[PDB]
Amino acid sequence: QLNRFVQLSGRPPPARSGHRCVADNTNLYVFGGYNPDYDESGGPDNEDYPLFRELWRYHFATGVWHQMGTDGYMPRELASMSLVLHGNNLLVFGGTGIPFGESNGNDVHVCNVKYKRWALLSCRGKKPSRIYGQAMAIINGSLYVFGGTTGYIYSTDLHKLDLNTREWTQLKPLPEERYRHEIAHDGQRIYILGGGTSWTAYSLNKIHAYNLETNAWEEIATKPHEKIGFPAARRCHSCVQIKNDVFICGGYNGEVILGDIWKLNLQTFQWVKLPATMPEPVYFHCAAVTPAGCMYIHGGVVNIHENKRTGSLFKIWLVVPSLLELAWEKLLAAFPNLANLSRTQLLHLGLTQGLIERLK
Amino acid sequence: DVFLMIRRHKTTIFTDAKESSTVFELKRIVEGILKRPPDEQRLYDGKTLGECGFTSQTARPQAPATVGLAFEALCIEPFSSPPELPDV
Amino acid sequence: MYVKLISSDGHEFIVKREHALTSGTIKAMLNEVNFREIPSHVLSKVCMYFTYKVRYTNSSTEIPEFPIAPEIALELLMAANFLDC
Amino acid sequence: LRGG
């Protein structure tokens, strides 16, 4: 009963959709969010309605939501932006404001969580056009950005940015034009999962993989389940990666919201349907994974006809946790007062510096 | 599929077996580990584990049950007792 | 094909080599391995977890939770930190 | 082409 969805609680942010989130061993960072409901979205107190220009964090050890009071210039593209975590920094690229397509983003912002600071990268070269819904990845210390519509016309470029020299370039090698897809990688190839236009959703039984070495695209036919079949075609889903494994969760094809979760092995290309169904099936949500191997899911749209959002947060264990993680969870559950003791008291107890930093 | 911790004095052996496995198979594998012929040892003979009470529900790998092995009466030294420490 | 470990108070735990290779520290050490600090009630649970993790890794079905008594939680955490498992 |  460990690989099931468990709803967390403990002031939680209002319901939002279109946001993104990333996770490390300590906190879950949530950026962006859009909610058109006036009463739900903090009323007149939210000066950026219907956009959530707030960066939140969930503390795993204490189960508390903290809204960061960062400085600098928070980017205005708060819907369908792309966010990644590199070391102790958040890299934000793309996205759109409101109304959709009126003002998109094509630059890169960086936020240091430890310093809690915002800045803009001074990258030079031919940058991608202002797009949203694209997908990025970090491979070999370089940024790969693919897809994303410009608002009226779709894109298929595979731009690459060198972070060491901060140099932009376009990769010239074909997959269909799509947006709100997902990216997987293994250091040699980049795999496209899901996505689609506003009138169709592309099937996941065939995957387009771009080869960095050969500089050409290829098509891979994934094997199906034993008696379940391929995952249903979906867009606006969520994807996480653990070693050579890719987990797809949520999304919808246009008329039905899917609340299942699937796993694909990047070596044998075999699909596995995990026996877990969401308590509330959502799309356009955000999902993230921790180095331990726990997946967190937040936000999204619950009803496709009433256009109802949610603020429920769920956690699930995708792999067998390490003994350190199991002991940590049991100790935190058994003795909630541990968070109140100072660092010296915990050191006298015997906890290492890293464990204290995670707890405190 | 059940899991077992053979206990004798300060010695514990972790192993696994099938519900269709016999007691003689257990004796043979412990002979393989600690080099003692099956005829010289008893556990608490030919009846398989299916009717020996070693069900797969209660012998889960996260909490296998113990069997007492003798070569003499049983002697299983208990593990060290956990200490007591204040909440603060 | 079996690896032999000794607790702090002299208890003996014989496990399969594959299960004991789960922890990085034991693999780096590598037969007999003597643990001068880990007590018996913690080494037992460490072998319990070795078996459980080896059996239930890459499994499609649901994975049952690992029962941990609150008293041994801190020492088991310390051993897990040391053994890298 | 909703972004939310």
Residue numbers in the entry:
A (entry chain A): 41 to 50, 87 to 249, 256 to 442
B (entry chain B): 2 to 45, 53 to 79, 86 to 102
C (entry chain C): 17 to 46, 58 to 112
D (entry chain D): 73 to 76
What does the paper say about this structure?
Although ARIH1 is not the preferred ubiquitin-carrying enzyme for this reaction, we were able to obtain a cryo-EM structure at 3.33 Å resolution for the overall complex, and ~5.5 Å resolution over KLHDC10’s propeller, representing ubiquitin transfer from the active site of neddylated CRL2KLHDC10-activated ARIH1 to Lys48 on an acceptor ubiquitin recruited by KLHDC10 within the complex. The overall conformation of the ubiquitylation complex is similar to analogous complexes reported previously, and thus we focus here on substrate binding by KLHDC10. Visualization of details of the substrate binding site was achieved by focused refinement using a mask over the ubiquitin-KLHDC10-EloB/C region, resulting in a map at 3.19 Å. Most strikingly, the C-terminal Gly adopts yet another unique orientation in KLHDC10: instead of facing blade 4 (KLHDC2) or 5 (KLHDC3) of the Kelch-type β-propeller, here it faces blade 6. The C-degron binding pocket within KLHDC10 is relatively smaller than in KLHDC2 or KLHDC3 (~15 Å long by ~8 Å wide), but maintains the organization of two chambers separated by a ridge. Unexpectedly, KLHDC10 employs a variant motif - FSR (Phe366, Ser93, Arg391) - in blade 6 to engage the substrate’s C-terminal carboxyl group. The substrate’s carboxyl forms an anion-pi stacking interaction with KLHDC10’s Phe366 in lieu of contacts with the first Arg from the RSR motif observed in KLHDC2 and KLHDC3. On the other hand, KLHDC10’s Ser93 side-chain hydroxyl and Arg391 make interactions resembling those from the RSR motifs in KLHDC2 and KLHDC3. The C-terminal di-Gly sequence is further anchored by KLHDC10’s Ala155 from below and flanked by two aromatic residues, Tyr110 and Phe176, on one side opposite of Phe366. KLHDC10’s ability to recognize Ala tail substrates might be explained by a constellation of hydrophobic residues consisting of Leu127, Ala155, Try110, and Phe176 that from a small hydrophobic pocket adjacent to the Cα of Gly76, leaving just enough space to accommodate an Ala sidechain.
The largest cohort of CRL SRs recognizing terminal degrons are the four BC-box proteins in the KLHDC-family (hereafter collectively referred to as KLHDCX), KLHDC1, KLHDC2, KLHDC3, and KLHDC1031,32. These SRs all feature Kelch-type 6-bladed β-propellers that recognize C-degrons bearing terminal Gly residues. Members of the KLHDCX family employ Kelch-type 6-bladed β-propellers to bind substrates, and a BC-box binding EloB/C that serve as bridges to a cullin (CUL2 or CUL5). Importantly, we discovered that these E3s share a defining C-terminal carboxylate-anchoring element (R/F-S-R) establishing them as C-degron E3s.
